[PDB]
Amino acid sequence: SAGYTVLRILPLVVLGVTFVLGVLGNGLVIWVAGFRMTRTVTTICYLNLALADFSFTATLPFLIVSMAMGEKWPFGWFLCKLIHIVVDINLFGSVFLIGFIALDRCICVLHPVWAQNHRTVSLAMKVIVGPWILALVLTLPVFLFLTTVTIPNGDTYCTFNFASWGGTPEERLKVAITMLTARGIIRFVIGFLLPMSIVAICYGLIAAKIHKKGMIKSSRPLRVLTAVVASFFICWFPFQLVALLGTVWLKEMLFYGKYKIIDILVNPTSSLAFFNSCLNPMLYVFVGQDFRERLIHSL
């Protein structure tokens, strides 16, 4: 009864809070770490992550407006294309850069000599382009296949129209089921499994090394490590699991209407997943003494 309305507006308010906090925090990180601090490898990584999160959260009002009226698109074809391009590029870049930061920290901790001899700002700038290239490659079907479809009652949904690529009245089956299944599998494997495995393995190695070397004086290192790992997991795993379940039950969901719970769990879980964009600056940037000192000295 009333609980359904609560589940209706809960993702909306979560996304609005995410928009406000993400814009504020990512703008603060960009300003400070790009115009008041010396350029280092960690500063470059934080700047790239902040740019991804900020560009994603700047598109959040459009997604909130679209979701509030039942996935309808009130804007134009160009805005549908541009907004979804930005969303995909920056949402994949966020997880790729989180994995990149985890790998960089693991290398710095486990091979300090190699990090001292080879980890430089120029090399970091050269190699941090890889996550962006992978995100851009994953965003290609948004460039090509996505478009705005107007169903008879002028409803204007921005979806993956396949009529242009089809040639038969059965061009939906085996051409859209296959594409959506591949999309969901890639989403789970590359959007969640790869960055999650990288993050977990790297931070577990860091924790084990600093425990064996007896560097744990306070609880702060372990608190920060567990917060960084658990925030990524708690934010992304429910949404990725729901999306993967929808992928593996796609045919028997759309053909007959079996799993409606997976259908109605998409919005709250996706809002929780997108909350990580506003969570990231607090986890990675507003945890450093030097950054906090520079921020308070700047304002």
């Binding site: 300090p112 990090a115 001292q116 600093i210 070397k213 560097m215 920060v224 990675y284 450093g288």
Partner: protein, 215 residues
């Protein structure tokens, strides 16, 4: 005359590129400040391949060691120049506990001044307690009460050296940001340089953790 303006801008950009490359090369070295006594012996140990600089390489890590023993002037006027070194190596002759103001007392005062210094709040200190064999030979004929009247242990090298190590590490009034790595210097090959490598590796790891945000 704008061709010369573009030529000047090009030359400045080339100089900028050279400066960036030179800074990248320089940041790769590990800067060590050597203070102290067996300082020359330690330098000879770390000897492979106004102020005197000694460069060596161990396990693909490059160390630049600076000796400022020939600076008879006031230290506080130039000591800030070494704010930012990876670590400080402090040499103390264990056999100075007999020599006279007591030599070991003067060494303790210098160590206290260096360790509790506003420019070295977080800099780690590698303390070498040299002349172990001479100290062991002298500890059987001159008791540590000659230097420390409050000592109560037997005239044994182990106890009389543990006391000195503990009472040198007690002068660290900031055991929350810096570490003191104490090594009893021995003539064993590569031992002191391996100890320096281990301590510097720990310092580098801790600096990386601080920079990332864990520490």
């Amino acid at each position: 005359v704008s061709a010369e303006d573009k030529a000047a801008a090009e030359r400045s950009k080339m100089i900028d590129k050279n400066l960036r490359e030179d800074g990248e090369k320089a940041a790769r070295e590990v800067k060590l400040l050597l203070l102290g006594s067996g300082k020359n012996t330690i330098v000879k140990q770390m000897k492979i391949i106004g102020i005197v600089e000694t460069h060596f390489t161990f396990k693909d890590l490059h160390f630049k060691m600076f000796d400022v023993g020939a600076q008879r002037s006031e230290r506080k006027k130039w000591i800030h120049c070494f704010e930012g070194v990876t670590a400080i190596i402090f040499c103390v002759a264990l056999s100075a506990y007999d020599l006279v103001m007591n030599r070991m007392h003067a060494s303790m005062k210098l160590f206290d001044s260096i360790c509790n210094n506003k420019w070295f709040t977080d800099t780690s200190i590698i303390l070498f307690l040299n002349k172990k064999d001479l100290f062991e030979e002298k500890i059987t004929h001159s008791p540590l009460t000659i230097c420390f009247p409050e000592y109560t242990g037997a005239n044994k090298y182990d106890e009389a050296a543990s006391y000195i190590q503990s009472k040198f590490e007690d002068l660290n009034k900031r055991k929350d940001t810096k570490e003191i790595y104490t090594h009893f210097t021995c003539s064993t090959d590569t031992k002191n340089v391996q100890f320096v490598f281990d301590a510097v590796t720990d310092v580098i790891i801790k600096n990386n953790l601080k920079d990332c945000g864990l520490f």
